[PDB]
Amino acid sequence: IVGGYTCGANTVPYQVSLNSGYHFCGGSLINSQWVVSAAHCYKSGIQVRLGEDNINVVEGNEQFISASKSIVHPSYNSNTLNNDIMLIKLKSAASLNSRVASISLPTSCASAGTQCLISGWGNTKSSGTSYPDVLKCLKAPILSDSSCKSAYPGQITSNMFCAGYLEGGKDSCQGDSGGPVVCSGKLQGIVSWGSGCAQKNKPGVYTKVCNYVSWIKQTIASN
């Protein structure tokens, strides 16, 4: 997260870290057994880390649970990042508490201008590299689809939306991928892609979760 703020320990209790010997992506707990992330975060041997603040220090509220299965969206296209969504099942159910909590799925899209919370452990610099140990947060508004498509001509599908600031300086970044965009108490987005980070007229692009709720519910119920 570039241009954000320190969230505060466990203030985003649905935020998970995906770990394969190191943090590599975020995700969101949607029920005690299931995490949603980005398809481009797929790999084998994922351990889900819940209740994290400092990802480098055991602080006492963590749950580390291996994934039993990963399901990439059937239509995921790694060339265009269309349908950049995947589900991860926990080998054992997470223990829900004040610091480990699920985030509700949306019933409809969110309007342009709605304020959202984006979070993750990704790079905090727009030109250099500096990775934080504690969770970072950003309030960012949903941008109009027209401004999103104007910024990325030929590359935005109906399964993507933009959020952030056209003036630059505030954006998600590498290492935030797969993490949440939450608006009005619902998981509206997944950190997906963008042109650099926090650059002018190149806002963050996010998977449009509301388009996938039917697939999420059917897939979880069958797996």
Binding site residue list for Ca(2+): 52, 54, 57, 62
- Which of 17, 23, 28, 40 is catalytic? The answer is 40
Q: What is 13-102+211-223's CATH superfamily?
A: Trypsin-like serine proteases (2.40.10.10)
Say whether 23 is catalytic: no
The binding site for substrate consists of 171-172, 174-175, 177
Active-site residue 40, yes or no? yes
Fold match between domain 1-12+103-210 and domain 13-102+211-223: yes
Which resolution, in Å, applies to this structure? 1.4
Q: Which fold has domain 1-12+103-210?
A: Thrombin, subunit H (2.40.10)
CB half-sphere exposure, 15, CA atoms < 13 A? 30
Can you give the residue ranges of every domain in the chain?
Answer: 1-12+103-210, 13-102+211-223
